[PDB]
Design a protein around this ligand. Structure first.
Ligand SMILES: [Ca+2]
Ligand SMILES: [Ca+2]
Ligand SMILES: [Ca+2]
Ligand SMILES: [Zn+2]
Ligand SMILES: [Zn+2]
Lengths: 164, 36, 36, 36
């Protein structure tokens, strides 16, 4: 089901993001590069353009939080929930929230922020889910060598059914 | 007077929350024996 | 009589399903060679 | 006319994703001592 049901999308190509706060698990420039490369995975395959901003309102807020954090999607200590997105739209729409009890990383150990951000930014773009274990929008993350990363064909089918 | 039509369909629901994190990898085998 | 205006725009969709469980971590590298 | 039925239920949202694959396995302990 590779697209949001009914499906909200962005009605413009120039999209913005803001990092609300940073995780203490990582270097600041590695949180930056994880989110920058996670947006690049999706701009490679659509008309969309993604820009970081440092004050005011953004289309997509990136947030680190733990436990209850102001929507009906409360986090839950180490393990269990590691993140949640919201679909395209105003205010809380588009926003990607990540759990701070988890240990965020650049690498194969811990919790790989780039790979998680590809799925939850994928929902911030209006993706559904694939039913194939090879897909990034599948209901299962697998660790894959981030240095050689590719979308699956069913993820490219999904995002190209919403944009272009 | 006659009732009006049904409303538009509701907005889509929010996306699902991430599931349980994988368990820590098994510890490695003991290293090779000491040299003579 | 005149037919009414439409009803309100439907209740929002229920939230998406919670994720399943992470695959277990890859096994550790073999240890360093033992003491002489 | 009366203001209509309150609209069809919205589409239920797309799911989670299993939490990140398990940690690296710890490197094994150093090997057993060499031959006397
Ligand atoms: Ca937003
Ligand atoms: Ca958690
Ligand atoms: Ca943390
Ligand atoms: Zn939230
Ligand atoms: Zn999902």
């Amino acid at each position: 089901f590779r697209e949001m049901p009914g499906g909200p999308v962005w009605r413009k190509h120039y999209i913005t993001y803001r990092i609300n706060n940073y995780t203490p698990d990582m270097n600041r420039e590695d949180v930056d590069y994880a989110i920058r490369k996670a947006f690049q995975v999706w701009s490679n395959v659509t008309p969309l353009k993604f820009s970081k901003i440092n004050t005011g309102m953004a289309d997509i807020l990136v947030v680190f939080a733990r436990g209850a954090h102001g929507d009906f999607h409360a986090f839950d200590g180490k393990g269990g929930i590691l993140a949640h997105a919201f679909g395209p739209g105003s205010g809380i729409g588009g926003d990607a929230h990540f759990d701070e009890d988890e240990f965020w990383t650049t690498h194969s150990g811990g919790t790989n922020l780039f790979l998680t951000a590809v799925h939850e930014i994928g929902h911030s773009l209006g993706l559904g889910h694939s039913s194939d274990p090879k897909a990034v929008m599948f209901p299962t993350y697998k660790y894959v060598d981030i240095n050689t990363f590719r979308l699956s064909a069913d993820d490219i089918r999904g995002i190209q059914s919403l944009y272009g | 007077g006659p009732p009006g039509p049904p409303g538009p369909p509701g907005p889509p629901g929010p996306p699902g929350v991430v599931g349980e994190q994988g368990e820590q990898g098994p510890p490695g085998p003991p290293g090779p024996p000491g040299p003579p």
